[PDB]
């Protein structure tokens, strides 16, 4: 993340991460809200970062 | 569905004799891609009395080929076109013969 221009990292870490389609919830029978969305086969990346390993949230 | 083989009211191959150049035609083949057009043009280039062999797709989304043949005298587009198709059919015969021979050497 220290290789990219700062504007690109601002984009990714403020807007595009907050909009990507992925996990939603683990009990969808109770969340009655407008426009819940979800993939079929979510994944983790091939690489590893420090914080994703210490947090252990995929 | 409708993307596949040509419906009623349209020929599979449509011939067209070119007007401005002698020994010249344009074969508009329906329902094909690079698979047949490529082997047709590369068989045509091994002929003697041919001069120009190409194919192109009028839009890359639409599923049809237009082939063009310029030839010399002592021949025509029709003769070299049918020569190409028949010799490719003979090579597929000889290839199927070779492959069914080579399967037998795994003798069970």
């Amino acid at each position: 993340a220290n290789h990219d221009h700062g504007r690109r990292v601002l984009y990714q870490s403020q807007k595009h991460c907050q909009q990507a389609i992925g996990f939603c919830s683990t009990n969808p029978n109770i969340r009655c809200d407008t426009l819940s969305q979800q993939l079929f086969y979510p994944q983790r990346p091939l690489f590893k970062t420090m914080a994703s390993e210490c947090l252990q949230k995929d | 569905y409708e993307r596949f083989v040509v419906p009623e009211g349209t020929k599979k191959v449509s011939y067209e004799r070119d007007t401005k150049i002698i020994n010249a035609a344009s074969f508009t083949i329906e329902r094909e891609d690079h698979t047949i057009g490529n082997i047709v043009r590369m068989q045509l280039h091994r002929d003697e009395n041919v001069l120009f062999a190409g194919y192109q797709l009028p839009h890359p989304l639409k599923y049809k080929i237009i082939v063009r043949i310029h030839t010399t005298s002592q021949s025509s587009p029709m003769q070299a076109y049918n020569q190409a198709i028949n010799d490719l059919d003979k090579e597929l015969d000889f290839l199927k013969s070779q492959f069914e021979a080579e399967v037998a050497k795994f003798s069970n």
């Binding site: - | 150049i21 043009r41 280039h45 120009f52 062999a53 190409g54 194919y55 192109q56 237009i66 063009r68």
Partner: protein, 97 residues
């Protein structure tokens, strides 16, 4: 006071790599000849010792022309829908076009 339509991203790259490869073979030439117009001119190099005929890429550029063009330029010379001479300058290529 200029043209509102100039050659964009990939097209100018195609012209650059076509300039650095000045000669074409027979098969690629006749394949490219299907697109524009003006069938095809006679080959520049009609024979050599090793290969067959060989084309230049200026003859390939002729296929997009209209009929009976005659205009004088800084590097380009067009007489009768043919591209007679074309200057070296790859640096000014978006201007000579």
């Amino acid at each position: 006071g200029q043209l509102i339509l100039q050659l964009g991203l990939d097209s100018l790259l195609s012209l650059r790599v076509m300039m650095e490869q000045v000669f074409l073979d027979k098969a690629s030439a006749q394949q490219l000849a299907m697109y524009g117009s003006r069938s095809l001119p006679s080959p520049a190099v009609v024979k050599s010792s090793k290969s067959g005929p060989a084309w230049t890429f200026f003859q390939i550029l002729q296929l997009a022309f209209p009929e009976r063009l005659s205009c004088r330029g800084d590097g380009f010379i067009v007489g009768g829908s043919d591209l007679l001479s074309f200057d070296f300058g790859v640096d000014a290529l978006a201007s000579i076009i």
